[PDB]
Structure formats: structure tokens, C-alpha cells
Design a protein around this ligand. Structure first.
Ligand SMILES: [Zn+2]
Length: 180
């Protein structure tokens, strides 16, 4: 599917304040796969959208207090039913990696795009999510050729800090649907 001025043509647009420029206005070359669930283990709620736009209610759930002090964001979320939500245009810097490193290069926010799958490290992701993530990645690949050769997990760039997307993420099934 197509890209429209840095946005997904087939995604809900949820413009977050949480973003800034990529240095040198560099084109992103890496894809970083994440997972997220709020509160942990639960799906469907409004909390992901809120955390990413800086408006989560610290008090809504015991878990949220901690993350309110956070200022994070991703480019896209793909929900359990496959719904795609976008928060940042791809040309811009979302705040999804944190302290990280790929192939010698730190600060992966700089040169990566970050896509989250609603889910956990130990729960299976859905058929919709596999199809949708593939769609999106094929899109990016058309735009940024280099991403074909650079696709990783948050756990792979922040080892012993992050575990997402976990053993649950079937890299076999995912590559298969990519660069068709
Ligand atoms: Zn992550």
C-alpha cells in the first residue's frame, strides 16, 4: 500500500506531540519491531494512544504512575484485530528505542522507524497482525530500500534492557510475507 507525505494511507492518524527531527534529516534505514500492552498483558484499551501522546492518566492503573514520567512515542501501533494506528510521520524522529545500538551506531531513534505490535513476549501475535505488519513493512521498503536489509527487534538493539518483541515474534513467518 502507499505512503502519503510520510503517513500510512490506510492507518488511523493520531498525531502525537512526541517527536522531533532526525539529525541531518537522514532517511530511516532500519525497522525496529516492538511490543506493548497497557496495562501489561491486557489489550484493547485507550492507554497506548495516550502514553504515546503524553496524556496518560498516571492514576488510571497502578502501572501507569511509573510511565507518566516517560516521554516516549512510536511511529505505528498494530492492534490485535489488525487496526493500524499512526502517531508520527516516518521522516520524523519518534522516541521508541531509548538507549540502543545497531552495528556500531547508537541512538537508533535517529535512523530507525518503530512499529509496535499490541501483545507480549510470550503470547502469540494474531494472523491480522502478521498480515498488517507485512503490508506496512512492504510499504516502507518501497520508500526506503535499505530497510529490506535492516529489520530487527527492540531486544536486538537493547539487549539486557528490552525483551520486546520476545520469542513470540515469528521472524520466519514475517520475512516470508516481506519483499514479495
Ligand atoms: Zn520496545
Amino acid at each position: 500500500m502507499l505512503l502519503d507525505e510520510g503517513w500510512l494511507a490506510e492507518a488511523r492518524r493520531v498525531p502525537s506531540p512526541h517527536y522531533d527531527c532526525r539529525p541531518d534529516d537522514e532517511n530511516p534505514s532500519l525497522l525496529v519491531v516492538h511490543n506493548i500492552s497497557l496495562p501489561p498483558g491486557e489489550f484493547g484499551g485507550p492507554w497506548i494512544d495516550a502514553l504515546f501522546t503524553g496524556t496518560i492518566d498516571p492514576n488510571a492503573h497502578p502501572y501507569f504512575a511509573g510511565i507518566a514520567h516517560l516521554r516516549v512515542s512510536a511511529h505505528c501501533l498494530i492492534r490485535r484485530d489488525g487496526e493500524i494506528v499512526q502517531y508520527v510521520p516516518f521522516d520524523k524522529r519518534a522516541w521508541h528505542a531509548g538507549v540502543s545500538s545497531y552495528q556500531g551506531r547508537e541512538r537508533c531513534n535517529d535512523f530507525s522507524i518503530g512499529i509496535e505490535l499490541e501483545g507480549t513476549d510470550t503470547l502469540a501475535y494474531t494472523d491480522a497482525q502478521y498480515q498488517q505488519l507485512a503490508a506496512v513493512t512492504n510499504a516502507l521498503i518501497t520508500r526506503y530500500p535499505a530497510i529490506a536489509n535492516n529489520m530487527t527487534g527492540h531486544c536486538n538493539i537493547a539487549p539486557e534492557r528490552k525483551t520486546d518483541p520476545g520469542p513470540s515474534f515469528d521472524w520466519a513467518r514475517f520475512r516470508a510475507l516481506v519483499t514479495p
